[PDB]
């Protein structure tokens, strides 16, 4: 009742904050316009009106920057978020933002590719895997995570709660007030359990599998940060986006 209003509240805010949702993405991928398919260097050149490894990586950065802004706007709508200490608000975003991006990137993906440029394109998994030395390894773990995660079959309303659970992790480094975060998160976890019991009544053990994926995201995010440092050792004066530099600065 108070837990359904919380679900309904989070769904509305998720729709206000995130312009490309799992429902919008899946409507495009299922076969109902039509995105340009980029499967090689030729098709890429063809669909440029909608160094490549580096040009694609910069797109990954730019879209990751916009996602941080969307996640920050969404976080503010989480009941209690704004009244937590401001340093704790920073920490929660700084540590949880890459887990959410990973979760939400799964929403645009299948085993063959990813929806790009607001749904106008579709870059193949084989074309990204085909990129030079470090850049070729960038997407593959995201694809492997999406395949196992998309099989859970969550929609936008389920995901709205899960994203809120992730932001409100009381175990992030340097938090000043653990208890208020854990308390909001218990309410959010309850809400999540009830949403999955009603939205997937046939799907027993879904909240369980979802909590395991939540634990997995931590390991999955460190591996992505490890990969980003490999880029900095190989590539020169290029650098990361001020905001990304700021999130990645001293983790």
């Amino acid at each position: 009742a108070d837990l359904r209003a919380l679900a309904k509240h989070l769904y509305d805010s998720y729709i206000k904050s995130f312009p490309l949702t799992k429902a919008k993405a899946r409507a495009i991928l299922t076969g109902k316009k039509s995105p340009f398919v980029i499967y090689d260097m030729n098709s890429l050149m063809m669909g440029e009106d909608k160094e490549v490894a580096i040009r694609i990586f910069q797109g990954c950065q730019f879209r990751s920057v916009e996602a941080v802004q969307e996640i920050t706007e969404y976080a503010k709508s989480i009941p209690g978020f704004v009244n937590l200490d401001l340093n704790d608000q920073v920490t929660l975003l700084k540590y949880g933002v890459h887990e959410i991006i990973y979760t939400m990137l799964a929403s645009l993906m299948n085993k063959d590719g990813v929806l790009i440029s607001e749904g106008q394109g579709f870059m193949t998994r084989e074309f990204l895997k085909s990129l030079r030395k470090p850049f070729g390894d960038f997407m593959e773990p995201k694809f492997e995570f999406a395949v196992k995660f998309n099989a859970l079959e969550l929609d936008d309303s389920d995901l709205a709660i899960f994203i809120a659970v992730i932001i409100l992790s009381g175990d992030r480094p340097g938090l000043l007030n653990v208890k208020p975060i854990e308390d909001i998160q218990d309410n959010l976890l309850q809400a999540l359990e009830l949403q999955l019991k009603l939205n997937h009544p046939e799907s027993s053990q879904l909240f369980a599998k979802l909590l395991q994926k939540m634990t997995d995201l931590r390991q999955i995010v460190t591996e992505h940060v490890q990969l980003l440092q490999v880029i900095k050792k190989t590539e020169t004066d290029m650098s990361l986006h001020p905001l990304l530099q700021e999130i990645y600065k001293d983790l």
Binding site: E73, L86, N87, V90, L93, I247
Partner: peptide, 16 residues
């Protein structure tokens, strides 16, 4: 946090 200028501004004022 002073060491997170953009994050702080996004939280305090939103995206410009």
């Amino acid at each position: 946090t002073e060491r997170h200028k953009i994050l702080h501004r996004l939280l305090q004022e939103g995206s410009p």
